[PDB]
Design a protein around this ligand. Structure first.
Ligand SMILES: Cc1cc2c(cc1C)N(C[C@H](O)[C@H](O)[C@H](O)COP(=O)(O)OP(=O)(O)OC[C@H]1O[C@@H](n3cnc4c(N)ncnc43)[C@H](O)[C@@H]1O)c1[nH]c(=O)[nH]c(=O)c1N2
Length: 455
DNA sequence: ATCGGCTTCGCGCA
DNA sequence: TTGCGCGAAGCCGA
């Protein structure tokens, strides 16, 4: 389906390899990008090669994301050579490195997947300028190409959802089988990059790592076994138990989908054919279909996705009007980060975020709204809630991150509610509201250990 | 074209 | 808990 490609640059198709510049979608199956690279490599009797660019951004988050990512690449690499596609791994800025790699190996054609974040689009430009062969983009990450789904920033779910469903019958389709190439250190990069990151690993008073790395096992292989678990054990109770922090009825797929270790489209396919509770199947389909992809919609059509300016006008006008309110408490980053607020429900969730790297969905909503209530300005609430989300979430640094922080503190894709001190018309949430929805003390007590335990 | 109808709200009440 | 009505509130879209 040609609608999944955009022509970034046009030109002289080299007598050489087709180059997949892998970035978002780190999987070898279920990958429209690797499929397109392999299509036009067959139309030219050239091999297809894969190149990944490892960049200095790993220092801005934690060992947890980097071991999750790097382990997934060790397994993609052997999985990619079993079908005769060599994987190449460059360490440097994709501005210069991908550029050089193009000239150096005589690439016939270049291809990349699609991120809507600002920095991938800075790179793509530095790539287009220092390059002579054609340059192609494929949305391998959304069921419906970001730029076809809609042509504007979408105001709400219920306005984006019809456009999306109207296009679902044509892009919800099976994946062809990736045919292997006809014509014919990462251990070490994992070593250095953890050495450089070990001085900042989150520790306990007894020098122990806070992080528990057994809750999510990385890779394509482990990814698919988590979807199969979810469809067989959890999908049915999803409508009813998804909002109860005390049960793991979440799919648990976000760390894998973030790193593109599983296609969102293979999951939809496999939910769609499964015979579960309708309400479960609907609730679930609109998270992974609508909300995931309005988040790409958000970050694409809004360059300042991660700042106050991108809130809707009414919530900008609201929070401004309450900047001069006395705040009940005020915390610093350090105080939040170590869960030293006055709110054991708040502090429990921050403990869940540090030791697992995935905080319960429903709780992240409460977490983010309390940052706005108990910090000195909204801009500073944004800053903390981004800092902590990207530092400690396994699925962080993600359009779902930005659009969800935005949802919580700024009202993006939300509506106006009853006007309050500090938080204005932004949707309010309370401990007492939690108490009627789920057994807070069970939550709190699962994590009440790790408080005194941390320094 | 004006009017439901809006992710995940809180709260009383049975 | 567990469900329902009602509240406050800005705006898109057929
Ligand atoms: C403050 C805050 C911070 C974040 C987020 C929300 C909030 C309120 N989210 C979005 C959401 O909280 C997160 O995707 C889910 O908790 C992922 O958990 P499961 O995969 O178990 O979801 P679950 O199995 O319930 O849902 C299925 C899938 O749908 C998608 N999805 C679900 N809820 C979504 C939402 N609210 N927005 C967008 N997509 C959603 C995800 O891909 C998720 O994997 C996010 N998400 C993320 O992937 N990375 C992040 O760093 C953040 N950050």
């Amino acid at each position: 389906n040609p609608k999944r490609i955009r022509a970034l640059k046009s030109g002289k198709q080299g007598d050489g390899p087709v180059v997949y510049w892998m970035s978002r979608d780190q999987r070898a199956e279920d990958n429209w990008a690797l499929l397109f690279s392999r299509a036009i490599a067959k139309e030219a009797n050239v091999p297809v090669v894969v190149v990944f660019c490892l960049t200095d951004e790993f220092l801005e988050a934690g060992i947890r994301q980097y071991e999750f990512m790097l382990k997934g690449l060790q397994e993609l690499e052997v999985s990619l050579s079993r079908k005769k596609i060599p994987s190449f791994f460059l360490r440097g800025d994709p501005g210069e490195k991908i550029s050089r790699f193009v000239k150096d190996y005589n690439a016939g054609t270049l291809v990349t997947d699609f991120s809507p974040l600002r920095i991938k689009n800075q790179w793509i430009e530095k790539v287009i300028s220092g390059i002579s062969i054609p340059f192609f983009e494929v949305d391998a990450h959304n069921v419906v190409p970001c730029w076809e789904a809609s042509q504007k920033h979408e105001y709400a779910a219920h306005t984006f959802r019809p456009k999306l469903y109207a296009l679902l019958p044509e892009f919800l389709e099976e994946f062809p089988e990736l045919e292997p190439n006809s014509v014919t250190t990462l251990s070490d990069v994992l070593e250095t990059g953890v050495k450089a990151l070990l001085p900042e690993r989150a520790l306990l008073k007894n020098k122990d790592p806070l992080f528990e790395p057994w809750h999510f096992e990385p890779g394509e292989k482990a990814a698919k076994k988590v979807m199969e678990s979810f469809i067989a054990d959890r999908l049915d109770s999803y409508g009813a138990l998804r909002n109860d922090p005390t049960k793991n009825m979440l799919s648990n797929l976000s760390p894998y989908l973030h790193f593109g270790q599983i296609s969102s489209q293979r999951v939809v396919l496999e939910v769609e054919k499964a015979e579960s509770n309708p309400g479960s199947k609907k609730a679930f389909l609109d998270e992974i279909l609508i909300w995931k992809e309005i988040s790409d919609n958000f970050c694409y059509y809004n360059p300042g996705y991660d700042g106050f300016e991108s809130f809707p006008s009414w919530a900008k006008e609201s929070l401004n009007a309450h900047r001069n309110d006395v705040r009940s408490h005020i915390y610093t980053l350090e105080e939040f980060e170590a869960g030293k607020t006055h709110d054991p429900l708040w502090n429990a969730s921050q403990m869940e975020l540090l030791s697992t790297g995935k905080m319960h969905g429903y709780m992240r909503m409460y977490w983010a709204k309390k940052i706005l209530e108990w910090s000195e300005s909204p801009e500073k609430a944004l800053e903390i809630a981004i800092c902590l989300n990207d530092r400690y979430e396994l699925d962080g640094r993600d359009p779902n991150g930005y659009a969800g922080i935005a949802w919580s503190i700024g009202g993006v894709h939300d509506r106006a509610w009853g006007e309050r001190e500090v938080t204005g018309k932004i949707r309010y949430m309370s401990y007492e509201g939690c108490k009627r929805k789920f057994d807070v003390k069970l939550y709190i007590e699962k994590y009440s250990a790790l408080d005194k335990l941390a320094a």
